[PDB]
Structure 1
């Protein structure tokens, strides 16, 4: 039945735990609805320090938006309106205010990230990027 039953992929960032999952689901819902306020609620509800908050935010931005950008089927690509909502929200957010974090996030939402035009390499790369940026 396996071959008859059959495109979702895994998310190894789940290694962080429940808080990344919550923030990721919140970001996905808020981007699809394009009303970036649940993002604020998730960022306030979370338990971890500011730098881990920013890292989780960056990883969610990548997993949802940048991977959607990697599909050949353009209709799945993030809509300009979603870019508008998340770009504005990043601009008004403070833990993302560090020019490097804000630039990297915005580049994920706008696909202007170098290295982000393999999958496992790309995922480890973006994880290292987030950790280095946010790691003080």
Structure 2
């Protein structure tokens, strides 16, 4: 009954996969320096690194929050570790990205409450919406400056 969902962000590949594996490990244990070790093991600089981190954090907290058995696990003394890593590392401590990511931590982003009653396509629409939000925040690019404002 633990038939989990697909992680569509491995299209990036072999540098998102490593950091998402280390974020799932830092989900299961409590040491968070492993994420920093994976971040110094990567090319594709600060926007792409931040996009990898935010999508890894999303896919772990989303696959946790949706399933009824393991709901709200980082509240069990574990949001302190990832939030101290947020307060320390400047790779994701940009205050608009940071106020987005804190909202993703404590489930107060109003995209998870998307209330699509299809319950199959709801997963896909949530994933594309948080993907484009990660790209619009992390992307400092002219051809995303209208749509970010949109």
Matching of residue 39 in structure 1 with residue 35 in structure 2: yes
1:127 matched to 2:131: yes
Distance 1:48 1:82 in 2: 29
> Do the aligned partners of 1:91 and 1:97 also contact (CA within 8 Å) in 2?
yes
Aligned to 2:148: none
- Give TM-score scaled by structure 1 length: 0.89
Q: Distance in 1 between matches of 2:74 and 2:102?
A: 14
Counting matched residue pairs gives 130
**Equivalent residue, structure 1, for 2:99:** 103
Structure 2 residues without counterparts, runs of 5 or longer: 114-121, 141-150
Out of 48, 53, 57, which is 1:57 matched to?
53
Partner of 1:21: 17
Alpha-carbon separation, structure 2, partners of 1:26 and 1:115: 25
CA distance in structure 2 between the partners assigned to 1:98 and 1:64 by the alignment: 21
2:147 is aligned to none
Runs ≥4 residues deviating over 3 A: none
Q: Could you say which structure has the higher helix fraction? A: 1
Which gives a bigger RCO, structure 1 or 2 (Cα 8 Å, sep 6+)? 1
Pairwise CA RMSD: 1.5
The answer to whether the 8 A contact 1:31-1:85 is kept is no
1:89 to 85, 100, 103: 85
2:74 to 79, 103, 113: 79
| Contact kept in structure 1, 2:65 and 2:72, CA below 8 Å | yes
Cα deviation, residue 76, structure 1: 4.5
Q: CA deviation at 1:97?
A: 1.6
